[PDB]
Amino acid sequence: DEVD
Amino acid sequence: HKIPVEADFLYAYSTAPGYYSWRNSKDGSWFIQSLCAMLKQYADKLEFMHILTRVNRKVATEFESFSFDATFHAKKQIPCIVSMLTKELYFY
Amino acid sequence: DNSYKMDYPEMGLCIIINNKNFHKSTGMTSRSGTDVDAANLRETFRNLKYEVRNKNDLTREEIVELMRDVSKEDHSKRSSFVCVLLSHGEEGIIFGTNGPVDLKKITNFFRGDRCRSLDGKPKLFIIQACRGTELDCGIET
Ligand SMILES: [Cl-]
Ligand code: NA
Ligand code: NA
Ligand code: NA
Ligand code: NA
Ligand code: NA
């Protein structure tokens, strides 16, 4: 999980 | 006689105003994952707003971030449907 | 007349802008997993009978040019228009590979008075991008  | 020049747009945002949006490096983004799944399952059955509402539920209920960084861990997301459409939209 | 007419000869275009790698000058993180999204969307909208066009790693100039050119096509035989933006973003903004561009500039090309052959037809923008830097901590049900 990573943020944009 | 005339229609508004802003009529008949639909913006399907992955996330609420002001918020991060989440993307998984192996599975893809939460929102596009869910959008494609709901379109595959319901494009022959449901109007587009109701499809997008099921996307909202799927992202809201089945996803939660997992992070070694506690400040990014266990976070949630809600997509944001913005409709200036004037009619119902069916893909069949 | 409660439902859009979707039995034109063509469902319409589906333009997918897939921005994964950004210029060092910007520093933005590479968007691992976005290729899975782009392929998923390509297949999903293929099965919906859209004419899909995938474009990868576009500068903000290239995004504006592509949207301008697509808006100047003749969509008379098309039922709808779809544009999917996969990138970084901020509120109101999506990132080209070299910097931010206002979403309003992209969508303005398809305004009712600027793209006449899409008048009365649904114009869908699907946006996988951040809209800020707040996190939703959730609440136990
Ligand atoms: Cl990828
Ligand atoms: Na997402
Ligand atoms: Na949605
Ligand atoms: Na959110
Ligand atoms: Na905005
Ligand atoms: Na969040």
Short mmCIF file of C-alpha atoms and ligand atoms in Angstrom, two decimals:
data_model
loop_
_atom_site.label_atom_id
_atom_site.label_comp_id
_atom_site.label_asym_id
_atom_site.label_seq_id
_atom_site.Cartn_x
_atom_site.Cartn_y
_atom_site.Cartn_z
CA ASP A 1 0.00 0.00 0.00
CA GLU A 2 1.21 3.43 -1.15
CA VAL A 3 -0.30 6.87 -1.43
CA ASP A 4 -0.87 8.88 -4.67
CA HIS B 1 -33.54 25.88 -26.12
CA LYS B 2 -30.07 25.76 -24.51
CA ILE B 3 -28.31 23.37 -22.16
CA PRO B 4 -25.63 24.48 -19.67
CA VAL B 5 -22.10 24.11 -20.99
CA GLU B 6 -21.21 22.27 -17.74
CA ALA B 7 -24.04 19.73 -18.12
CA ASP B 8 -23.49 16.01 -18.79
CA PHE B 9 -20.15 15.58 -16.99
CA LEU B 10 -19.47 12.89 -14.44
CA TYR B 11 -16.31 12.91 -12.33
CA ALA B 12 -15.65 9.59 -10.59
CA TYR B 13 -12.96 10.54 -8.08
CA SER B 14 -11.07 7.80 -6.26
CA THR B 15 -11.14 9.71 -2.96
CA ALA B 16 -12.80 12.53 -1.05
CA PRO B 17 -11.72 16.19 -1.45
CA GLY B 18 -8.53 16.87 0.49
CA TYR B 19 -7.50 13.23 0.98
CA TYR B 20 -4.79 10.87 -0.12
CA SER B 21 -5.83 8.05 -2.45
CA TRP B 22 -4.40 4.55 -1.97
CA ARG B 23 -2.63 2.35 -4.52
CA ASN B 24 -1.32 -1.17 -3.91
CA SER B 25 1.95 -1.96 -5.65
CA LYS B 26 0.89 -5.52 -6.58
CA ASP B 27 -2.91 -5.35 -6.98
CA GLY B 28 -3.34 -1.81 -8.33
CA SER B 29 -5.25 1.06 -6.79
CA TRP B 30 -8.15 0.29 -4.46
CA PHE B 31 -10.51 2.41 -6.54
CA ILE B 32 -9.66 1.12 -10.02
CA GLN B 33 -9.60 -2.45 -8.67
CA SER B 34 -13.13 -1.99 -7.36
CA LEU B 35 -14.37 0.04 -10.33
CA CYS B 36 -13.37 -2.65 -12.83
CA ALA B 37 -14.79 -5.43 -10.64
CA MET B 38 -18.16 -3.69 -10.27
CA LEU B 39 -18.31 -2.84 -13.99
CA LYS B 40 -17.53 -6.46 -14.86
CA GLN B 41 -20.22 -7.75 -12.50
CA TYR B 42 -22.93 -5.10 -12.97
CA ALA B 43 -22.55 -3.21 -16.28
CA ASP B 44 -25.27 -5.41 -17.80
CA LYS B 45 -27.57 -5.02 -14.76
CA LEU B 46 -27.24 -1.61 -13.08
CA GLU B 47 -27.37 2.10 -13.86
CA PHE B 48 -23.95 3.77 -13.65
CA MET B 49 -24.61 5.72 -10.42
CA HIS B 50 -25.64 2.50 -8.70
CA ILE B 51 -22.51 0.80 -10.04
CA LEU B 52 -20.40 3.63 -8.63
CA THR B 53 -22.26 3.40 -5.31
CA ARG B 54 -21.22 -0.27 -5.03
CA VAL B 55 -17.66 0.85 -5.81
CA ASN B 56 -17.97 3.27 -2.88
CA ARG B 57 -19.05 0.43 -0.58
CA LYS B 58 -16.38 -1.97 -1.82
CA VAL B 59 -13.57 0.55 -1.32
CA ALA B 60 -15.03 1.66 2.02
CA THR B 61 -15.49 -1.84 3.45
CA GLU B 62 -12.93 -4.25 1.97
CA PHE B 63 -9.77 -2.10 2.03
CA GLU B 64 -7.61 -0.86 4.88
CA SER B 65 -4.01 0.25 4.59
CA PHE B 66 -1.21 -1.90 5.99
CA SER B 67 2.00 0.00 6.68
CA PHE B 68 5.20 -0.46 8.66
CA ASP B 69 4.89 3.30 9.24
CA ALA B 70 2.29 3.67 11.98
CA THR B 71 1.27 7.09 10.68
CA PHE B 72 0.09 5.49 7.38
CA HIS B 73 -1.28 2.27 8.87
CA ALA B 74 -4.90 1.12 9.22
CA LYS B 75 -6.26 3.99 7.09
CA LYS B 76 -9.49 3.98 5.06
CA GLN B 77 -10.80 5.56 1.86
CA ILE B 78 -14.12 6.67 0.39
CA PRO B 79 -14.39 7.56 -3.35
CA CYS B 80 -16.32 10.66 -4.44
CA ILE B 81 -18.95 10.64 -7.22
CA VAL B 82 -19.53 14.08 -8.75
CA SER B 83 -22.46 14.04 -11.16
CA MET B 84 -23.59 16.83 -13.46
CA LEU B 85 -25.37 14.25 -15.63
CA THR B 86 -28.93 14.92 -16.74
CA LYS B 87 -29.91 11.32 -17.56
CA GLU B 88 -29.42 7.77 -16.38
CA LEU B 89 -26.52 5.88 -17.96
CA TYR B 90 -26.69 2.19 -18.89
CA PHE B 91 -23.90 0.40 -20.73
CA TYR B 92 -26.24 -2.14 -22.36
CA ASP C 1 -36.11 10.60 -22.22
CA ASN C 2 -34.76 9.45 -18.83
CA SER C 3 -31.73 7.55 -20.16
CA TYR C 4 -28.91 8.67 -22.41
CA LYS C 5 -29.08 7.32 -25.97
CA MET C 6 -26.33 4.68 -25.99
CA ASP C 7 -27.12 3.00 -29.34
CA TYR C 8 -24.99 5.22 -31.57
CA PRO C 9 -22.71 3.20 -33.89
CA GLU C 10 -19.87 3.47 -31.36
CA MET C 11 -19.92 3.57 -27.56
CA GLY C 12 -17.14 6.17 -27.81
CA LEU C 13 -13.50 6.72 -26.89
CA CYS C 14 -11.88 5.60 -23.64
CA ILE C 15 -8.63 7.53 -23.21
CA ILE C 16 -6.42 6.09 -20.45
CA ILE C 17 -3.52 8.30 -19.30
CA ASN C 18 -1.21 6.13 -17.21
CA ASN C 19 1.56 8.17 -15.54
CA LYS C 20 3.95 5.87 -13.67
CA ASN C 21 7.42 7.45 -13.86
CA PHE C 22 7.94 11.15 -13.16
CA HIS C 23 10.89 13.37 -14.03
CA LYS C 24 13.67 13.52 -11.44
CA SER C 25 13.19 17.31 -11.55
CA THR C 26 9.84 16.67 -9.80
CA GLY C 27 10.89 13.87 -7.41
CA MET C 28 7.38 12.36 -7.33
CA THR C 29 7.32 8.66 -6.44
CA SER C 30 7.05 6.04 -9.16
CA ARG C 31 3.47 4.75 -9.07
CA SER C 32 4.02 1.01 -8.66
CA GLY C 33 0.89 -0.98 -9.54
CA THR C 34 -0.53 1.57 -11.99
CA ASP C 35 0.22 -0.71 -14.96
CA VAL C 36 -2.10 -3.29 -13.40
CA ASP C 37 -4.78 -0.57 -13.27
CA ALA C 38 -4.22 0.49 -16.87
CA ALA C 39 -4.50 -3.08 -18.17
CA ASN C 40 -7.56 -3.78 -16.01
CA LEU C 41 -9.27 -0.67 -17.38
CA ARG C 42 -8.26 -1.49 -20.95
CA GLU C 43 -9.88 -4.92 -20.68
CA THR C 44 -12.92 -3.68 -18.74
CA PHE C 45 -13.75 -0.96 -21.24
CA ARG C 46 -12.92 -3.24 -24.18
CA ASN C 47 -15.68 -5.56 -22.98
CA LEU C 48 -17.97 -2.51 -22.80
CA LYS C 49 -17.18 -1.92 -26.54
CA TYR C 50 -15.20 1.30 -26.06
CA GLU C 51 -12.42 2.31 -28.44
CA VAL C 52 -9.65 2.31 -25.82
CA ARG C 53 -6.45 4.33 -26.29
CA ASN C 54 -3.71 3.80 -23.68
CA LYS C 55 -1.08 6.54 -23.25
CA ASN C 56 1.86 6.25 -20.84
CA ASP C 57 4.00 8.82 -19.00
CA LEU C 58 2.75 12.09 -20.49
CA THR C 59 4.09 15.53 -19.64
CA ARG C 60 1.57 18.17 -18.58
CA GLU C 61 1.97 19.71 -22.05
CA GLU C 62 1.31 16.35 -23.70
CA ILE C 63 -1.83 15.80 -21.58
CA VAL C 64 -3.27 19.18 -22.61
CA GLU C 65 -2.40 18.53 -26.27
CA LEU C 66 -3.95 15.07 -26.27
CA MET C 67 -7.15 16.35 -24.64
CA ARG C 68 -7.32 19.28 -27.07
CA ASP C 69 -6.88 16.97 -30.10
CA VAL C 70 -9.41 14.42 -28.84
CA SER C 71 -11.93 17.19 -28.16
CA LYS C 72 -11.56 18.34 -31.77
CA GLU C 73 -12.42 14.91 -33.20
CA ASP C 74 -15.89 14.34 -34.64
CA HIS C 75 -17.79 12.34 -32.01
CA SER C 76 -21.13 12.44 -33.90
CA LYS C 77 -21.31 8.63 -34.20
CA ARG C 78 -20.22 8.10 -30.56
CA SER C 79 -22.56 7.67 -27.60
CA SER C 80 -20.24 8.94 -24.88
CA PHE C 81 -16.70 9.88 -23.93
CA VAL C 82 -14.52 8.38 -21.19
CA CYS C 83 -11.18 9.68 -19.92
CA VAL C 84 -9.24 7.89 -17.17
CA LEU C 85 -6.41 9.71 -15.37
CA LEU C 86 -3.95 7.64 -13.33
CA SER C 87 -1.35 9.84 -11.67
CA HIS C 88 -0.36 11.82 -8.64
CA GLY C 89 -2.54 14.75 -7.76
CA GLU C 90 -3.60 17.48 -5.36
CA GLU C 91 -7.04 19.05 -4.93
CA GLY C 92 -8.14 20.14 -8.41
CA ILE C 93 -4.85 19.03 -9.96
CA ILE C 94 -3.32 16.08 -11.77
CA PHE C 95 0.39 15.66 -12.45
CA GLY C 96 2.00 15.27 -15.79
CA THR C 97 5.37 13.60 -15.61
CA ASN C 98 6.94 17.07 -15.32
CA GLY C 99 4.44 18.93 -13.16
CA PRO C 100 0.89 19.78 -12.17
CA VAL C 101 -1.96 20.76 -14.46
CA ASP C 102 -5.43 21.94 -13.38
CA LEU C 103 -8.15 19.37 -13.98
CA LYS C 104 -10.33 22.29 -15.10
CA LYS C 105 -8.00 22.92 -18.06
CA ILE C 106 -8.36 19.30 -19.20
CA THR C 107 -12.12 19.10 -18.82
CA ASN C 108 -12.80 22.55 -20.31
CA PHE C 109 -12.04 21.16 -23.78
CA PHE C 110 -15.21 19.06 -23.57
CA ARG C 111 -17.57 21.84 -22.41
CA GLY C 112 -20.88 21.90 -24.26
CA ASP C 113 -19.87 24.96 -26.27
CA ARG C 114 -16.33 23.73 -27.06
CA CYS C 115 -17.01 20.13 -28.16
CA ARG C 116 -20.31 20.29 -30.03
CA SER C 117 -20.39 16.65 -31.16
CA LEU C 118 -20.53 15.55 -27.50
CA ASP C 119 -23.47 17.89 -26.66
CA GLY C 120 -26.10 16.05 -24.64
CA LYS C 121 -23.77 13.03 -24.32
CA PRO C 122 -22.17 11.80 -21.07
CA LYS C 123 -18.54 12.83 -20.59
CA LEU C 124 -16.96 10.67 -17.88
CA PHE C 125 -13.69 11.53 -16.11
CA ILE C 126 -12.38 8.76 -13.86
CA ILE C 127 -9.58 10.03 -11.62
CA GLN C 128 -7.20 7.86 -9.59
CA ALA C 129 -5.07 10.59 -7.95
CA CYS C 130 -4.58 12.15 -4.54
CA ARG C 131 -6.66 15.22 -3.72
CA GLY C 132 -4.55 16.35 -0.78
CA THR C 133 -2.59 14.85 2.09
CA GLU C 134 -5.24 14.03 4.70
CA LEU C 135 -5.70 10.46 5.88
CA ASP C 136 -9.01 8.88 6.87
CA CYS C 137 -8.48 7.07 10.18
CA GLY C 138 -11.85 5.32 9.96
CA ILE C 139 -14.23 4.45 12.78
CA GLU C 140 -15.05 1.02 14.18
CA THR C 141 -18.49 -0.11 13.04
CL CL D 1 3.09 -0.89 -12.36
NA NA D 2 -7.64 4.08 -4.94
NA NA D 3 -17.35 5.43 -6.75
NA NA D 4 -10.77 8.88 1.34
NA NA D 5 -11.46 20.24 -7.09
NA NA D 6 -6.77 7.39 4.10
#
